[PDB]
Every structure is written in structure tokens, then in C-alpha cells.
Amino acid sequence: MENPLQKARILVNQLEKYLDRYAKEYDVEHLAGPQGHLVMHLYKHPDKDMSIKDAEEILHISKSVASNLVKRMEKNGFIAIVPSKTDKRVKYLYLTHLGKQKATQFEIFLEKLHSTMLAGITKEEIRTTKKVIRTLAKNMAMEDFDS
Amino acid sequence: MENPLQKARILVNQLEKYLDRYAKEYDVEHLAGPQGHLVMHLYKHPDKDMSIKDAEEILHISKSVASNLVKRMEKNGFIAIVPSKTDKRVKYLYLTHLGKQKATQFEIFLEKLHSTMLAGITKEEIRTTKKVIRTLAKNMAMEDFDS
Ligand code: HEM
Ligand code: HEM
Numbered sequence: 050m051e052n053p054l055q056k057a058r059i060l061v062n063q064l065e066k067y068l069d070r071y072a073k074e075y076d077v078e079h080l081a082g083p084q085g086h087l088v089m090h091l092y093k094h095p096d097k098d099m100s101i102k103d104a105e106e107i108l109h110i111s112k113s114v115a116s117n118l119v120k121r122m123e124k125n126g127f128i129a130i131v132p133s134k135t136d137k138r139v140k141y142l143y144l145t146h147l148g149k150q151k152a153t154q155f156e157i158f159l160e161k162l163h164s165t166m167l168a169g170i171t172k173e174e175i176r177t178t179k180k181v182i183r184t185l186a187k188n189m190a191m192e193d194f195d196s
Numbered sequence: 197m198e199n200p201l202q203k204a205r206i207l208v209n210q211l212e213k214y215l216d217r218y219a220k221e222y223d224v225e226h227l228a229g230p231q232g233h234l235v236m237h238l239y240k241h242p243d244k245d246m247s248i249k250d251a252e253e254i255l256h257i258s259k260s261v262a263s264n265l266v267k268r269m270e271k272n273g274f275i276a277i278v279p280s281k282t283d284k285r286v287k288y289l290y291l292t293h294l295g296k297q298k299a300t301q302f303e304i305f306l307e308k309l310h311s312t313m314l315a316g317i318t319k320e321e322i323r324t325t326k327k328v329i330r331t332l333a334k335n336m337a338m339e340d341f342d343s
């Protein structure tokens with residue numbers, strides 16, 4: 050269709066605006082991306098621990114990025130960063146009272162968000178749409194289908 | 197799905213790259229957007245004429261933009277800009293030999309492009325996909341469904 054790139058970008062920009070507004074309403078700002086992922090990981094596996102190294106592996110990111118991410122999670126009060134008692138070179142992450150509230154709020158938000166967004170759309174229609182995208186991606190990438 | 201905005205943007209960026217590479221191969225660079233639209237309009241209605249004012253109305257753009265667009269079409273050698281003989285305040289646009297070659301090349305390109313992109317996708321699947329997008333747009337816009 051005419052002006053393919055402008056129309057697609059106008060839609061994603063709209064969606065970004067929607068998600069940002071919805072997130073603020075549920076007080077789960079900054080949890081839409083990587084912060085959310087790690088908070089929900091901590092919350093759902095309290096048996097286990099997560100070092101900064103574990104964070105890198107879990108999100109497939111470099112040390113420097115992982116380090117920036119966890120420092121900002123701490124800034125936000127979601128986690129405390131405490132070196133290993135046995136070896137003070139390993140940094141372990143622990144969800145705070147606030148990070149735990151944020152976790153239970155984020156789960157609700159994602160449920161309500163999907164209910165709202167996906168109202169009037171079937172599992173079959175999703176499957177169809179997903180296939181058309183995948184086929185489009187495959188037709189216009191060729192040997193570069195490593196994505 | 198996780199990282200919704202990053203995944204959508206990575207796909208549109210890919211598509212932009214594809215279209216740019218495909219356009220260069222068919223020598224119809226700069227015709228992907230507004231230039232194409234006006235060249236194909238000129239080519240398909242040689243009976244009629246197109247002023248800069250007609251260009252504004254046809255593309256729903258302001259005078260200043262229309263003026264920048266046609267000056268760049270002239271720079272590219274697709275058109276000649278010649279004031280009305282009767283009234284030298286009306287500017288009329290005329291497709292050149294080159295603009296006409298470009299027009300017949302652009303038509304081929306769009307046919308091949310769609311054949312390639314839409315291979316392995318049915319009219320029903322398009323209709324489905326279109327409905328899911330429209331419903332998504334409607335669910336996440338509400339009163340701002342003026343798009
Ligand atoms: C500059 C790029 C493009 C232009 C100018 C363009 C233009 C058009 C035009 C004019 C039509 C209508 C043709 C007709 O009247 O029969 C059309 C149809 C269509 N385009 Fe595009 N298009 C472009 C890129 C794309 C892309 C990237 C996609 C999808 C990846 C796409 C998907 C379609 C589809 C599905 C149709 C419907 C064809 C039909 O069944 O009639 N187009 N496009
Ligand atoms: C930050 C934003 C979002 C996050 C973190 C996110 C995350 C997720 C997650 C984790 C799932 C899997 C849930 C499960 O295991 O049951 C999921 C499913 C899904 N998401 Fe999202 N999502 C987001 C936004 C969106 C958006 C914007 C759309 C579409 C507009 C969307 C469409 C879907 C769909 C269709 C499913 C499939 C649900 C199913 O049938 O199991 N999501 N999302």
C-alpha cells in the first residue's frame with residue numbers, strides 16, 4: 050500500500066504512547082522492558098539468586114549494559130545490590146518491598162493490557178497474522194533470515 | 197509479546213532497507229513516495245494538466261511542501277515546470293522523456309515488488325491481517341480513532 054513505512058511508523062508511535070500512558074496509570078512505569086523482565090524473574094524464583102552475570106545471560110546483553118540496567122533498577126528502588134559474602138566480586142540482586150509491590154502490579158497490568166488490546170481478536174486470527182508477518186519477513190530478507 | 201516496539205521497528209527498518217535496495221535495482225529511486233504518485237498521475241492523464249495547486253490538492257499537502265517536492269522532481273529531470281501562458285502565476289508540470297521512462301519502470305517495479313513480497317500469502321490472509329491491525333488500532337486509540 051502507498052506510504053508503507055510512514056503508515057507502519059505512525060501505528061508503532063501510537064502504540065508506544067498507549068503503553069506509556071497505560072503503564073503510568075498502573076504505576077509500573079520503567080517496567081515495560083528489561084527492568085520488568087528481571088523483577089518478574091526475581092519474584093518468581095525466590096529459592097534462587099541472580100548475580101549481575103546471571104542478569105547478562107538471562108537478557109543476552111553485555112556486562113556494561115547489564116551494569117547500567119541494574120544500577121537504574123537500584124535508583125528506582127526495585128532491587129538492592131549486595132556483593133557475595135564469600136567472594137566480594139560477585140554482585141547479587143534482591144527485590145525490595147517496593148520491587149515486590151511493582152512485580153504484583155506489573156502482572157495485573159500485563160493481563161489487563163492484553164485483555165484490552167486483544168478484545169475482538171481470535172486465537173486463529175493471531176495465528177494467521179503471525180504467519181503473514183513471518184512470511185513477509187522471510188520474502189524480504191532472503192539469506193539474512195537470522196532474526 | 198515481550199519488547200513489542202523494538203521488534204516492530206526492527207521489521208520496518210528491514211523493509212525500508214529492502215525497498216531502497218529493490219528501487220535502486222529497477223532505477224526508480226526517489227519514486228517510492230510522493231514523486232512516484234505525481235509521475236504516475238501525469239503519465240496516466242496526459243489529456244489533463246497539473247498545476248502546483250493541483251499537486252497540493254492531490255497529495256493533501258501545503259503550498260511550501262508541494263513547492264519543495266516539485267522543485268526536487270525538476271532537479272531529478274522527471275518534470276519541467278512552465279508557467280501558464282495566459283497567466284504567469286499558475287505553474288504547470290509536464291513529464292519529460294525521462295520522467296516517462298521512470299513512469300513505465302515504476303509500474304513494473306511495483307508489480308514485481310508485490311509479487312515477491314506477497315508470495316505464499318492469500319487474499320483471505322491479507323483480509324484477516326488487515327482486520328487484526330484495524331481492530332488493534334481501534335482498541336488502543338479509543339476517541340482518537342481519526343487515523
Ligand atoms: C513504496 C512501496 C509501495 C507502494 C507505492 C505500494 C503501492 C501499492 C498500491 C498502489 C497498491 C494498489 C494496487 C492496485 O490498485 O491494484 C498496493 C497494493 C498492495 N500493497 Fe502495496 N505498495 C508498496 C509497498 C508494499 C508493501 C511493503 C507491502 C507489504 C509488505 C504492500 C502490500 C500491498 C498489498 C497487500 C496490496 C494489496 C494488493 C491487492 O490485492 O490489490 N505494499 N500497493
Ligand atoms: C511491554 C509490552 C508487552 C509485554 C511485556 C508483553 C509480554 C507478553 C508476554 C510475556 C506474553 C506471554 C504471556 C503468556 O505466557 O501467557 C505476551 C503474549 C502476547 N502478547 Fe504481549 N506483551 C506486550 C505488549 C503486547 C502488545 C502491544 C501486543 C499486541 C498489540 C501484544 C500481543 C500479545 C499476544 C497476541 C500475545 C499472545 C497471548 C497468548 O495467546 O498466549 N502484546 N505478551
Ligand SMILES: [Co+2]
Pocket residue numbers: 132133134135141
Ligand atoms: Co551472599
Ligand SMILES: [Co+2]
Pocket residue numbers: 279280281282288
Ligand atoms: Co499553458
